[PDB]
C-alpha cells in the first residue's frame, strides 16, 4: 500500500519552466531509488531521469541532459523533477516510481521499476489562456428520431482544457454526454455536451449548461431551447 | 506553577530536511525541600524520545 | 554468576508508532558454560523462549 502523489497537472509557454513534484507513502523514498518517464499523447514511453534518495546520485537522459534536474526532499518524503526551458514538443505525461537500485548498487539497471504515480500532466503550447464561448444547441427541427430530442452546448476557442459543463448544477445527469474537446488549426480547443430528454418536455423543463473554466474564471450558463 | 507539577507533554516535528538538535537537561536537588518545592512531587522523571 | 544488570521502566508519552505510543527496550546476556542465567523481574518484563 504505497501511494503517489504528484503535482497538479500545470501548463506553461515554451521557454517557461515547470516543476513535477511526487510524494510517497508507506516505505520511505530514502529507501527507495526513483526515475522519471515522459508519456507523449500516444507516442510510447520514454524515461529521463534517475535520482537516489540517501544516495543523492543523479544521471540523465544524454537527450536533455542540464535542461532537467533531480531534488529530494529527505525531510518532506517528496521528490523533486525540474525541467527550465522547456520546449513545445516536450509537454506529455510525467510519472516516478520505485526503484531498488539504492546504496551499494547505484546502477538502476538491476532494479524493475514498481508503483508508478498516477501521473502530472504538463503542457507546452504558445497559445494563452482564453474565455470560453458558451453557445446553445437545440433541435433544427424537432428530432422526433428513435427517441426524445437532443439539445446542448458549445464551447469554442478556449484554453487551456478542460472546463467543466454541469447541466443545471447536476440537475441534469441522465443522457448526458460530453464529447472530447479537438485542439484547433488555431491553437485552441472546443468539447460539446449533448443530452437526451423526452421530446414530449421540450418546452416543459429547460436546460442550462454550467460551463465553468477555472483557466478563465468564466463561468457562462446558457439556455437551450427549440 | 501555583501548588501543582502537570505531567509535561509535548510534540515537535522535524518537518524540515535537515537534522535538528536539540539541547536538553535534567535538574539534580541538593535537598527534598528543594525537590518538593521546585518540582512539586518528590520524584522527578524527563522521557526525551524520538 | 559473571555480570549483573537491572533495568526500569520509563512510563511515558512518546512519538507514535504502529499506533502504540509504547516501547520495548532490547537487552541480551550472553551465558558462558557452566555459569548460569537467573531473571528477577517486578514486572514490565519481556523474557525470552
Ligand atoms: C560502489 O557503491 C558506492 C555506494 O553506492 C558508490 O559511491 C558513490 O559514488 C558516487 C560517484 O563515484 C558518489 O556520487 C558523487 O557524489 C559527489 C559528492 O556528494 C556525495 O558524496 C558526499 C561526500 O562523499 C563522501 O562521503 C563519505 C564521507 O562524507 C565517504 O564515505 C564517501 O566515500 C565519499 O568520499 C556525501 O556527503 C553526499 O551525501 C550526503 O548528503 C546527503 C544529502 O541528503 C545525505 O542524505 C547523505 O547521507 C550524505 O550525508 C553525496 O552522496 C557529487 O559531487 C558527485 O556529483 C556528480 O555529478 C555532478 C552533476 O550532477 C557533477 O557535477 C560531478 O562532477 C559528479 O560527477 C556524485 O554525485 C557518491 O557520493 C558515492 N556514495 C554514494 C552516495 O553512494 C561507488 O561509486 C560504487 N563504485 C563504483 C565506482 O562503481
Ligand atoms: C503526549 O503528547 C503527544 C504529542 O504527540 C500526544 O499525541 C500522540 O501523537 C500521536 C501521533 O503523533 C497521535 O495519534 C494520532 O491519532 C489519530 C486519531 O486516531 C483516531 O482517529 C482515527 C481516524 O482519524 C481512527 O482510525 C482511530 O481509531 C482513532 O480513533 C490518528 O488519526 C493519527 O494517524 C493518522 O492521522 C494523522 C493525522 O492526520 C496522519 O498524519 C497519519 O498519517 C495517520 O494516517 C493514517 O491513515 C492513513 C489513511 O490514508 C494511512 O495511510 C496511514 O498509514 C495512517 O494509518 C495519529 O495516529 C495521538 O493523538 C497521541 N498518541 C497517544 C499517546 O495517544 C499524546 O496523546 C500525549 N499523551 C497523552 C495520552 O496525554
Known amino acids: 500500500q504505497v501511494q503517489l502523489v504528484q503535482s497538479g497537472a500545470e501548463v506553461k509557454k515554451p521557454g517557461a519552466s515547470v516543476t513535477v513534484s511526487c510524494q510517497v507513502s508507506?516505505?520511505?523514498?530514502?529507501?527507495?531509488?526513483l526515475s522519471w518517464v515522459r508519456q507523449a499523447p500516444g507516442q510510447g514511453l520514454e524515461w529521463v531521469g534517475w535520482?537516489?534518495?540517501?544516495?543523492?546520485?543523479?544521471k540523465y537522459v544524454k537527450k536533455f541532459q542540464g535542461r532537467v534536474t533531480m531534488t529530494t526532499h529527505t525531510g518532506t518524503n517528496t521528490a523533486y523533477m525540474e525541467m527550465k526551458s522547456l520546449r513545445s514538443d516536450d509537454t506529455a505525461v510525467y510519472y516516478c516510481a520505485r526503484v531498488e537500485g539504492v546504496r551499494g548498487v547505484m546502477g538502476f539497471h538491476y532494479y524493475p521499476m514498481d508503483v508508478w504515480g498516477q501521473g502530472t500532466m504538463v503542457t507546452v503550447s504558445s497559445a494563452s489562456t482564453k474565455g470560453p464561448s458558451v453557445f446553445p444547441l437545440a433541435p433544427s427541427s424537432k428530432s422526433t428520431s428513435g427517441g426524445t430530442a437532443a439539445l446542448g452546448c458549445l464551447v469554442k476557442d478556449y484554453f487551456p482544457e478542460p472546463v467543466t459543463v454541469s447541466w443545471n448544477s447536476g440537475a441534469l445527469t441522465s443522457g448526458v454526454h460530453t464529447f472530447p474537446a479537438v485542439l484547433q488549426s488555431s491553437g485552441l480547443y472546443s468539447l460539446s455536451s449533448v443530452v437526451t430528454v423526452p421530446s414530449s418536455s421540450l418546452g416543459t423543463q429547460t436546460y442550462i449548461c454550467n460551463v465553468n473554466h477555472k483557466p478563465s474564471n468564466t463561468k457562462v450558463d446558457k439556455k437551450v431551447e427549440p | 506553577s501555583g501548588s501543582t507539577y502537570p505531567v509535561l507533554n509535548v510534540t515537535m516535528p522535524n518537518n524540515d530536511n535537515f537534522d535538528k538538535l536539540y539541547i536538553w537537561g535534567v535538574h539534580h536537588p541538593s535537598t527534598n525541600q528543594e525537590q518538593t518545592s521546585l518540582y512539586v512531587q518528590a520524584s522527578g522523571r524527563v522521557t526525551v524520545s524520538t | 554468576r559473571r555480570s549483573q544488570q537491572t533495568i526500569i521502566p520509563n512510563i511515558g508519552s512518546r512519538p507514535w508508532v504502529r499506533g502504540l505510543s509504547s516501547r520495548i527496550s532490547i537487552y541480551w546476556t550472553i551465558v558462558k558454560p557452566g555459569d548460569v542465567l537467573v531473571i528477577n523481574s517486578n514486572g514490565n518484563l519481556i523474557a525470552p523462549r
Open positions: 535520482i537516489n534518495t540517501y544516495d543523492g546520485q543523479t
Open positions: 508507506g516505505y520511505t523514498l530514502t529507501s527507495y531509488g
